[PDB]
């Protein structure tokens, strides 16, 4: 419950980047629909938009110089396929998207 | 379980991600309020696409 097999601190860090990319993917579409409007407020919306626009053309993948690019490419692929109702990382997202 | 539930088994495919860059996000997100409250399984296409990640094959 505290070792590298579960790590509460690390578990929150991958969740936080994963969700920030999910926000920024559609927020980039929202922003471009009005050129460059400053209507948002997420602390890293701009950070993710820069990484996402880069990822959309980057071909270095596993050997890229952008620390967030290869990480983000792998992080998205987890949530794209996981369905386990007690997954430590997906649980807050599986709850964020529940009918309750 | 004596006061709070234990931390579940972190997915091994995400353990491989270096989390040092992510430390900037440690107190800057709302995991539960970002989501459009639609469905979890809907993530297959709502999240991103093959052109968005430069799919090699
Ligand atoms: Zn935004
Ligand atoms: Zn890259
Ligand atoms: Zn999962």
From Swiss-Prot, chain B:
Q: Which domain of life is it from?
A: Eukaryota
Q: Where does this polypeptide localize?
A: Cytoplasm; Nucleus
Post-translational modification note: Tyrosine phosphorylated in response to IFN-alpha. 'Lys-48'-linked ubiquitination by DCST1 leads to STAT2 proteasomal degradation.
Q: Give residue numbers for the modification (Phosphothreonine).
A: 19
- Disease affiliated with this protein: Immunodeficiency 44: An autosomal recessive disorder characterized by increased susceptibility to viral infection, resulting in some patients in encephalopathy and infection-associated neurologic decompensation.
Q: What's the subunit arrangement here? A: Heterodimer with STAT1 upon IFN-alpha/beta induced phosphorylation. The heterodimer STAT1:STAT2 forms the interferon-stimulated gene factor 3 complex (ISGF3) with IRF9; interacts with IRF9 in the cytoplasm. Interacts with CRSP2 and CRSP6. Can form a homodimer upon IFN-alpha induced phosphorylation. Interacts with IFNAR1; the interaction requires the phosphorylation of IFNAR1 at 'Tyr-466'. Interacts with IFNAR2; the interaction is direct. Interacts with ARL2BP. Interacts with E3 ubiquitin ligase DCST1; the interaction results in STAT2 ubiquitin-mediated proteasomal degradation. (Microbial infection) Interacts with vaccinia virus protein C6.
Q: What does this protein do?
A: Signal transducer and activator of transcription that mediates signaling by type I interferons (IFN-alpha and IFN-beta). Following type I IFN binding to cell surface receptors, Jak kinases (TYK2 and JAK1) are activated, leading to tyrosine phosphorylation of STAT1 and STAT2. The phosphorylated STATs dimerize, associate with IRF9/ISGF3G to form a complex termed ISGF3 transcription factor, that enters the nucleus. ISGF3 binds to the IFN stimulated response element (ISRE) to activate the transcription of interferon stimulated genes, which drive the cell in an antiviral state.
* Family designation: Belongs to the transcription factor STAT family.
Q: What is this protein called?
A: Signal transducer and activator of transcription 2
Gene from which the chain derives? STAT2
Which part of the full protein does this chain span, and how long is the full protein? 786 to 838 of 851
């Amino acid at each position: 419950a505290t070792g590298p097999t579960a790590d509460p601190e690390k578990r929150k860090l991958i969740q936080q980047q994963l969700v920030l990319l999910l926000h920024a993917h559609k927020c980039q579409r929202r922003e471009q629909a009005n050129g460059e409007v400053r209507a948002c407020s997420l602390p890293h919306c701009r950070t993710m938009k820069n990484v996402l626009n880069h990822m959309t053309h980057c071909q270095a993948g596993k050997a890229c110089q952008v620390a967030h690019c290869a990480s983000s490419r792998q992080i998205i692929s987890h949530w794209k396929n996981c369905t386990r109702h007690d997954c430590p990382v997906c649980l807050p997202l599986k709850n964020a998207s529940d009918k309750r | 379980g004596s006061h709070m539930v234990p931390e579940p088994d972190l997915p091994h495919d995400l353990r491989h991600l270096n989390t040092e860059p992510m430390e900037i996000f440690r107190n800057s997100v709302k995991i539960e309020e970002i989501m459009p409250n639609g469905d979890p399984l809907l993530a297959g296409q709502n999240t991103v696409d093959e052109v968005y990640v430069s799919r090699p094959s």
